């Protein structure tokens, strides 16, 4: 399984793969893995029915994104603080915030959860 995780991510550099494609295909591995993880652990599950196992890979995948969505803004604040002066030179933060927030906007785009760039301030 540690392989499938490395393989998906490696496709950002090679193939110049879309950021959306990489994140989407990784959640499958986990969902595919958790479903595959449990079939090995419990026997009452392995005999629950096929319509009951595919539904798992879905229920997980949805929660994953919804969690990621609710988790974005607090992350920018955290990211901001961990790097915001005086943690770093203000003369240096002049070069950091913008690009940090550039990439964090890039995410704001894809997940379509915009966050104002105010968190990044002075």
């Amino acid at each position, epitope marked *: 399984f540690s392989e499938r995780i490395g393989n998906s991510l490696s496709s950002f550099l090679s193939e110049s793969a879309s950021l*959306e494609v990489i994140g989407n295909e990784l959640a499958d591995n986990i969902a595919n893995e958790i479903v595959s993880s449990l079939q090995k652990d419990s026997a009452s599950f392995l005999q629950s029915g096929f319509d009951v196992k595919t539904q798992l890979k879905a229920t997980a995948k949805k929660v994953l*994104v919804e969690a990621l969505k609710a988790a974005l803004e607090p992350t920018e604040k955290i990211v901001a603080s961990t790097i915001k002066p005086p943690r770093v030179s203000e003369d240096a933060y002049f070069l950091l915030g913008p690009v940090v927030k550039t990439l964090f906007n890039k995410v704001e785009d894809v*997940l*379509h*959860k915009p966050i104002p760039d105010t968190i990044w301030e002075y």
Partner: antibody
Framework: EIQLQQSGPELVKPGASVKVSCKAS????????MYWVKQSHGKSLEWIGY????????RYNQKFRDKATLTVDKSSSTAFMHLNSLTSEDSAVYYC??????????????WGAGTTVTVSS | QIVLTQSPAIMSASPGEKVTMTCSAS?????IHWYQQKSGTSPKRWIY???KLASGVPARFSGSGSGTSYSLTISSMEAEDAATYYC?????????FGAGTKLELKR
């Protein structure tokens, strides 16, 4: 049922602003996003922007970055679109729609009645 | 930024004829969405996630596509199928639409 109501048509004098609204019902107003679209001639469809109700953050198309300004009010389960410096090119039908992102590129599952705005002295 | 060109601009079809409208793009897209609009009405969600049909859409509709040439097809034209159909994408910001493909009925 799940239905998006808007405001009626507005005759607005050129160079004025207008604040149209789009209310929601049936579903949870705050869980889905609200996007705003324009249709000139009844032919060409153009995206303007959208806004996250819970966070309140907006995202605009470059063409309408300062022309349009979006606001919301959870109390009324309503979203608004604010416009400035209205020209003839700004007279068209404006729709409001719902969405929620599940990884794949976003689409529009619900559409409003369309608000026809008329700019003319 | 992405220009979507739909052809034909207008299209006639007799009941039962195989209908196919295109949306040629300037770049590639993984997923796409198709919307139906009739006169005086708001657009309606028609085909989400490229090939998934929406709640309340006959099965004669099966839209597909690959890369830059995504197309909508109908096995058998019918009266209620007559409408304007637009292509939409949000792989890249900004989100863009096709010129529009009107669908008339043949009498």
């Amino acid at each position: 049922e799940i239905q998006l109501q808007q405001s009626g048509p507005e005759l607005v004098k050129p160079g004025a602003s207008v604040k149209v609204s789009c209310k929601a019902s049936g579903y949870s107003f705050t869980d889905y996003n609200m996007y705003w679209v324009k249709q000139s001639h009844g032919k060409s469809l153009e995206w303007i922007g959208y806004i996250d109700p819970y966070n309140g953050g907006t995202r605009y198309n470059q063409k309408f970055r300062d022309k349009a300004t979006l606001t919301v009010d959870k109390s009324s389960s309503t979203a608004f679109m604010h416009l400035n410096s209205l020209t003839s090119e700004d007279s068209a039908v404006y729709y409001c729609a719902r969405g929620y992102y599940y990884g794949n590129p976003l689409h529009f599952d619900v559409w409003g009645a369309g608000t026809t705005v008329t700019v003319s002295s | 930024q992405i220009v979507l060109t739909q052809s034909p601009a207008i299209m006639s079809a007799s009941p039962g004829e195989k209908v196919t409208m295109t949306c040629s793009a300037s770049s590639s897209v993984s997923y796409i969405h198709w919307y139906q609009q009739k006169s005086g009405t708001s657009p309606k969600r028609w085909i989400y996630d490229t090939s998934k049909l929406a709640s309340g859409v006959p099965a004669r509709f099966s839209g597909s596509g690959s890369g830059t040439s995504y197309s909508l097809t109908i096995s058998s034209m019918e009266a209620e199928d007559a409408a304007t159909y637009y292509c939409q994408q949000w792989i890249s910001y900004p989100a863009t639409f096709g010129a529009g493909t009107k669908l008339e009925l043949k009498r």
